[PDB]
């Protein structure tokens, strides 16, 4: 599903932790 592209954004929140 093209949604797999939105899941990649989840990695962006990883930068906020550190």
> Which tokens belong to 14?
């990883």
Q: How far is CA 16 from CA 1, 6, 8, 12, 13, in A?
A: 27, 18, 15, 8, 5
Q: Quote the tokens at residue 3.
A: 């949604």
CA–CA dist 4, 18 (Å, integer)? 24
Judged by DSSP in three states, 3 sits in coil
- Cα gap 14→11, rounded to integer Å: 5
Q: Give the ranges where 1-18 is alpha helix by DSSP (H).
A: 4-17
Method: NMR
Give the CA distances from residue 14 to residues 1, 5, 6, in Å, rounded to whole numbers and listed in that order. Answer: 23, 16, 14
What is the Cα–Cα distance from 3 to 13, expressed in whole angstroms? 17
d(C-alpha 14, C-alpha 18), whole Å: 7
């Amino acid at each position: 599903f093209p949604r797999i592209w939105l899941h990649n954004l989840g990695q962006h929140i990883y930068e906020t932790y550190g």
